[PDB]
Design a protein around this ligand. Structure first.
Ligand SMILES: [Pb+2]
Length: 138
């Protein structure tokens, strides 16, 4: 059916079956996530956890495919699913990987200020940022 859960499930299955990964299978994977986004209206799904994972997966895959273009996809996921800490952290991780440390901190702090959940995740990420690690989570 047409809901984030069945979509997310079929997407993860596609990833598991796309190993080992080539540019061609990566492209196919990304196109499939875009088809999910075309079918799932954001305003119904702003607090749906599967929908949020779909948006973050699409951004992360685009981050691999073409980093200098992916930012707008991370912003889209944050605008659509602002309640979830993992969304903001994902954005902060991408900015960090680009050397954009000040922007990475602002994302984490804005999320704390806006009450994104769970708070523990934001605190760990911010701890790691200040310990100057490469990964906000592990
Ligand atoms: Pb609508």
């Amino acid at each position: 059916a047409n809901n984030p859960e069945d979509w997310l499930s079929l997407l993860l299955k596609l990833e598991k079956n796309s190993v080992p990964l080539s540019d061609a299978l990566l492209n196919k994977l990304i196109g499939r996530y875009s088809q999910a986004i075309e079918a799932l209206p954001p305003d119904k799904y702003g607090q749906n956890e599967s929908f949020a994972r779909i948006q973050v997966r699409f951004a992360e895959l685009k981050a691999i495919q073409e980093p200098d273009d992916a930012r707008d996809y991370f912003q889209m996921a944050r605008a659509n699913c602002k309640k979830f800490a993992f969304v903001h952290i994902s954005f902060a991780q991408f900015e960090l990987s680009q050397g954009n440390v000040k922007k990475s901190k602002q994302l984490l702090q804005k999320a704390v200020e806006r009450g994104a959940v769970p708070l523990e995740m934001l605190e760990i990420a911010l701890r790691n940022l200040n310990l100057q690690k490469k990964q906000l989570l592990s």
